[PDB]
Design a protein around this ligand. Structure first.
Ligand SMILES: Nc1ncnc2c1ncn2[C@@H]1O[C@H](COP(=O)(O)OP(=O)(O)O)[C@@H](O)[C@H]1O
Ligand SMILES: Nc1ncnc2c1ncn2[C@@H]1O[C@H](COP(=O)(O)OP(=O)(O)O)[C@@H](O)[C@H]1O
Ligand SMILES: Nc1ncnc2c1ncn2[C@@H]1O[C@H](COP(=O)(O)OP(=O)(O)O)[C@@H](O)[C@H]1O
Ligand SMILES: [Mg+2]
Ligand SMILES: [Mg+2]
Ligand SMILES: [Mg+2]
Lengths: 43, 428, 429, 40, 425
């Protein structure tokens, strides 16, 4: 499926793909998330 | 590691090897000799870069092995990847799916790039809470906001099953929702993950960003997309059929309007048709009119035929092209290589193939190439390299060249041996 | 438009009011007799009286046949449909050659549709029914519509109440109501009620400008072939048709007759106006015998456009025949149905004029001695070759830091690039 | 706890690999390209 | 295999370490110069450095051209792709000849893709949606509790997974397959229309590093048309007539880019192979003229041609005669390996090897007679007489072929030359 191209035409967009590439979670952030593991009022 | 692209017949060529004044430098960027032809190719490349004049046709004509396709590859390399360069063989137009005129039109339109700019206003953020009237809460690393939801928007949020913790993009111009992924967190780790699940960081900056995106397409792609409801599938399968003139005219006019509005840019490219003498009289007649269009790319052709029969007719014409089409184009002529040029071509091919050869080996291989053909000597380069490696040597000697010369025959020797035993071969 | 083509300098037939051709005008040089006859052909096209009249441009290569056809097209304007075709295009893989020919015939007959729509559009301000005693009974439905110009109250027929609830029209909704049918159509909440905090796109629209009641004229230009294609395959059968490849179809004469009837009804009703135009068939010698025979019947039709043929083949064997030679690769039967306009070779002076006009259109500064040298080259070789040398010589000059072409640049460009005859000489040796 | 944390590390490594492969690949054309290339 | 083919005895080229051809080894007899040349060609192919270089095997009919190509294929191995095709197979009625050639070019390029599959497999003991899904899997080695992403719940519902069923879950893709009911419940009813599958033997979590070999053409056809889509148009596409299509150059370029990316990542390995085009004289001028560019490409594989024609006319051309039925322009792009006629002793050795391969016991006198017959007619005719002669020997109650049986068979069956002589009279 890593080579499936036509399946991406109905699933993603080039700008969305660039956003996904930029904002992918790095290893250190997952390590930190595993290591660590708002009342509204109408003013 | 063995990448998809390996050492081919033109891998050593990385441009035309010209200077700023288009003066051809000997042995530059992999090109040897062909000074006049390389200068003409540089002039044509400047014409292509300028782009002002549509439908200029150039025919690179010469003897076999005189670098016509080498010059074409040098032009393709020197020309940037941004500018289209559609390289086909003459036989690619004879298709059972579409007429020859349709195939030539598609080659023409594939060689014209159109670069379309677009600005969109999208809201991208991580979903904090959703309440089924309706309310949606989004956040970034710098902001948090809450929106009110309409009927169609709540329907879209429900159908896509947007859940708290997702990162979504909503386009204000169209009101459509796209889920970029779900944010990883202490509680969202699982032992197995779905195929669609993508982990993504919370978006930065402001929720409502203003985008500027530029799409690079070609007129053929626009034609195919507009050919039918699911036309973009034909951009993969090639089952485009014959695209109607209505669609092409409407696209030419829409692209003209876009360029007038500044939305799109037109990048005219090159259509190289190698071995053009496979085209028939119908194809040449179509080209005579096709080059008169303002959306015509710069056309480059290559052939080695002399005064030969035009395909599809009984007439004989220079280069196998009727004089109607020959009068519409400029001819660049290649010249046979000298001993020095042959030796330098062999040296560059050895350098690309990573073959170390003794000087006597260079002399003998150059003599073999002059006597038989340049391509045969190029092939014998790697043949002798393999034979030398089998000998546990580190440098190719004359003995290895004699060995491969005895193992692999050329056209002349093979023809002589066939004629000697012609009683055994069929249909002499 | 912006890019410069081989014919981008042709702006029309340089004819005077008396129908005579100027020596050099509108980008055309010489061809006085041929431009005058093209002028009579242009008058024939604009007269709209005749159908199926054929004219053959015949003459040596590079004698302006295509330039004269595009000049006729420029003279006719953009209203008259001018359909260029090349004879190689009939050999389609989806449909028969006669279908391609008939389709291109119908592409050259234009039809201009005039639609006049009366609409009452505005933001709804009230939807009060008018109760009455029947002779709860309502006799009218009052709708108040607001636009940037003002407000209007409409005493609509009571039956519109069904459409109002079907469209879910409410106070503050922008709607439009067509005068004829009286059916309401809703187009979104007025943007004056849109907040920046709510998310919807299609459901908001700006308050209509102009008067509440509007009379709109919509003019659309179509061809008879456009109607043919539209009525041949209207757009689950639609799903299968859109999934499968929508090939061209051999449209039957029944459909064309029905469409002719409908267009005649529109012309009688005044809704539409016909604009018969021109089909230009270049390289007509690529047609085969079956195509020429079909053209015999096609040119005799009362519906056919005026067709412009071009040929340069001389006495050549007709395609699809064996050893049957004809004066232009066209059977003599078709040649009896066409008027022939001869085109003649240019003098060196005319060649210089054309070269200068081309240089002007390409934006190239050419010196007088350079122009003379390129003209003399063009008296050898061909006109097309000498024209093609212009821009590479301009680029060579720009490389050398010269704003105008000098003779040395023409010499160098000629030394780099060769013509068909020099290449034939090299091949012979 | 060493085995459990090694298994967790392996899960995190596989998560990273799969997510990198998924987010690495862009469409050839995309939805927006088709939308903007469409005639009215 | 089990059935003896025309080349079943060819197991390789029979070269020594020094690259010289043994006189009789690996089922090949003679053709020393041609076997040594094919050895250099095998080294070229295994080098995985060059692209689009081509070889033409030339010589009389029955001189081992196809046998030599199959010897090269044997020497390369199963991992290296080897696409055989004949010149007449380009005349597809669905796609243009250049498309058939491009397809065969792509087939000869392999791509070994390396992956660790992780799968959770077992019997279902609990399925409670909580969010997240908690599932409990049981195997012969124990029971495991797993927390599943909520997107897998839709997959579990589609597969109709219940407690007691044996299923497997892919860790990378989340695909769930219900592979029947556990055999422990085979006695829950006396008559149910269900497929009982045994409880998995290993652990619930199974790891296995695997390799798969694919060709670039497989990727091309996978991306040619959507598959597995739940949308109605994708379902109709599943229903519709499958046709070959003229796959576009842009899709091929994109596939090349993605494959290059994954080769860089290290999870795929290029395995360039060989495209074998037998009877290359059958190609028309259009095919050869396309093959010029095809061989000049940097992605093309090593292409082995074989022609038996003399100075015959190129197909699709009127009266233009070229050696081997191949235009001189393409001949300049290939290396020509010449095959020679066999000597009578070599024919005897070949007949012996063929008999040994077919399992036929032949006496010395019958072998000499068959060698004489092959010298007088053709090698293939003598070799073909072995099986009928063995049949007559078994009918006569003999386990070995005598000269009488060869005489009788050569009387029953005529060679081509004898039939030609008879029809000349
Ligand atoms: N100008 C050149 N410089 C370097 N190598 C060349 C040149 N021309 C041809 N070659 C060599 O010869 C082969 C290319 O010849 P080609 O251009 O295909 O001849 P043809 O004109 O018949 O197409 C390549 O292997 C290349 O190494
Ligand atoms: N009389 C003329 N005046 C101005 N330009 C001309 C004239 N005749 C030909 N040309 C131009 O020179 C070129 C000749 O090509 P074309 O007119 O197509 O010749 P053909 O008759 O062979 O089709 C075109 O660019 C055309 O615009
Ligand atoms: N060098 C060889 N050694 C052993 N057997 C051979 C040899 N060459 C051919 N044969 C046998 O004879 C048959 C005919 O040879 P073949 O390869 O078909 O020749 P070609 O392909 O040139 O027609 C082969 O199928 C094989 O069984
Ligand atoms: Mg070439
Ligand atoms: Mg013309
Ligand atoms: Mg064979």
């Amino acid at each position: 499926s890593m080579f499936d191209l036509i399946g991406l035409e109905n699933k993603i967009t080039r700008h969305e793909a660039e956003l996904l590439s930029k904002k992918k979670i790095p290893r250190k952030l997952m390590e930190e998330i595993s290591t660590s593991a708002p009342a509204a009022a109408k003013l | 590691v063995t990448r998809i692209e390996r050492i081919g017949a033109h891998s050593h060529i990385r441009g035309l090897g010209l200077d700023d004044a288009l003066e051809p430098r000997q042995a530059s960027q992999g090109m040897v000799g062909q000074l006049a032809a390389r200068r003409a190719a540089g002039v044509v490349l400047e014409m292509i870069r300028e782009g002002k004049i549509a439908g200029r046709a150039v025919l690179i004509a010469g003897q076999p092995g005189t670098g016509k396709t080498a010059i074409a590859m040098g032009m393709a390399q020197a020309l940037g990847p941004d500018t289209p360069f559609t390289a086909i063989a003459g036989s690619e137009i004879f298709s059972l799916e579409m007429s020859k005129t349709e195939a030539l039109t598609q080659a023409f339109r594939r060689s014209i790039g159109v670069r379309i700019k677009e600005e969109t206003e999208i809201i991208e953020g991580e979903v904090v809470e959703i309440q089924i009237v309706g309310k949606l809460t989004l956040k970034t690393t710098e902001m948090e906001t809450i929106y009110d939801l309409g009927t169609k928007m709540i329907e879209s949020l429900t159908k896509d099953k947007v859940q708290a913790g997702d990162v979504i993009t909503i386009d204000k111009a169209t009101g459509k929702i796209s889920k970029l992924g779900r944010s990883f967190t202490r509680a969202r780790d699982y032992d197995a993950m779905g195929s669609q699940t993508k982990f993504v960081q919370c978006p930065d900056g402001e929720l409502q960003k203003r985008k500027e995106v530029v799409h690079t397409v070609s007129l053929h792609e626009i034609d195919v997309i507009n050919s039918r409801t699911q036309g973009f599938l034909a951009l993969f399968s090639g089952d485009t059929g014959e695209i109607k003139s209505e669609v092409r005219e409407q696209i030419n006019a829409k692209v003209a309007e876009w360029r007038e509005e500044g939305k799109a840019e037109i990048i005219p490219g090159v259509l190289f048709i190698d071995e053009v003498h496979m085209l028939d009289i119908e194809s040449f007649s179509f080209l005579n009119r096709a080059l008169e269009s303002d959306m015509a790319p710069v056309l480059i052709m290559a052939t080695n035929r002399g005064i030969t029969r035009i395909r599809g007719t009984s007439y004989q014409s220079p280069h196998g092209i009727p004089i109607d089409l020959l009068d519409r184009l400029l001819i660049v002529s290649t010249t046979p290589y000298s001993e020095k040029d042959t030796k330098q071509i062999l040296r560059i091919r050895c350098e690309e193939e990573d073959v170390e050869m003794s000087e006597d080996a260079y002399t003998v291989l150059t003599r073999i190439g002059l006597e038989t053909s340049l391509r045969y000597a190029i092939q014998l380069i790697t043949a002798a390299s393999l034979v030398c490696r089998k000998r546990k040597g580190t440098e190719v000697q004359v003995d290895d060249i004699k060995r491969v010369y005895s193992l692999f025959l050329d056209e002349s020797r093979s023809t002589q041996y066939m004629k000697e035993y012609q009683d055994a071969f069929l249909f002499n | 438009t912006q890019r410069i083509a081989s014919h981008s300098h042709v702006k029309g037939l340089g004819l005077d009011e008396s129908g005579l051709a100027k020596q050099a005008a509108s980008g055309l040089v010489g061809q006085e007799n041929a431009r005058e006859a093209c002028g009579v052909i242009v008058e024939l096209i604009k007269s709209k009286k005749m159908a199926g009249r054929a004219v053959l441009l015949a003459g040596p290569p590079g004698t302006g046949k295509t330039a004269l056809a595009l000049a006729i097209a420029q003279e006719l304007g953009s209203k008259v449909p001018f359909c260029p075709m090349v004879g190689s295009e009939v050999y389609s893989t989806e449909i028969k050659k006669t279908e391609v020919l008939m389709e291109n015939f119908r592409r050259a007959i234009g039809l201009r549709i005039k639609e006049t729509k009366e609409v009452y559009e505005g933001e709804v301000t009230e939807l009060t029914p008018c109760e009455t005693e029947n002779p709860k009974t309502i006799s009218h439905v009052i709708i108040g519509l607001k636009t940037a110009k003002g407000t209007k109250q409409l005493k609509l027929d009571p039956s519109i109440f069904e459409s109002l609830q079907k469209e879910r029209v409410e106070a503050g909704d922008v709607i439009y109501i067509e005068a004829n049918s009286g059916a309401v159509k809703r187009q979104g909440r007025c943007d004056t009620y849109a907040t920046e905090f709510d998310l919807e796109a299609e459901e908001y629209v700006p308050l209509p400008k102009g008067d509440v009641h509007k009379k709109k004229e919509i003019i659309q230009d179509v061809t008879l072939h456009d109607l043919d294609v539209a009525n041949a395959r209207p757009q689950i059968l639609s799903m299968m048709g859109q999934l499968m490849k929508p090939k061209k179809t051999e449209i039957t004469d029944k459909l064309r007759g029905e469409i002719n009837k409908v267009v005649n009804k529109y012309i009688d009703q005044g809704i539409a106006e016909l604009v018969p135009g021109v089909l230009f068939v270049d390289e007509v010698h690529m047609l085969d015998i079956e195509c020429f025979t079909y053209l015999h019947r096609a040119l005799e039709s009362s519906i056919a456009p005026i067709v412009i043929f071009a040929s340069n083949r001389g006495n050549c064997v007709i395609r699809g025949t064996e050893d049957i030679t004809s004066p232009h690769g066209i059977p003599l039967d078709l040649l009896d149905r066409v008027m022939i306009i001869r085109t003649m070779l240019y003098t060196p002076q005319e060649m210089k004029q054309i070269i200068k006009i081309r240089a002007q259109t390409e934006g190239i500064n050419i010196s007088e001695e350079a122009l003379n040298h390129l003209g003399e080259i063009g008296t050898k070789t061909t006109l097309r070759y000498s024209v093609q040398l212009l821009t590479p010589a301009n680029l060579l000059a720009k490389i050398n830091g010269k704003d105008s072409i000098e003779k040395e640049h023409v010499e160098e460009i000629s030394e780099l690039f060769y013509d068909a005859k020099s290449s034939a000489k090299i091949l012979a040796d | 706890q060493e085995e459990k944390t090694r298994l967790l590390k392996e899960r995190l490594d596989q998560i990273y690999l799969v997510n990198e492969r998924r987010c690495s690949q862009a469409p050839v054309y995309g939805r927006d390209l088709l939308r903007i290339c469409a005639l009215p």
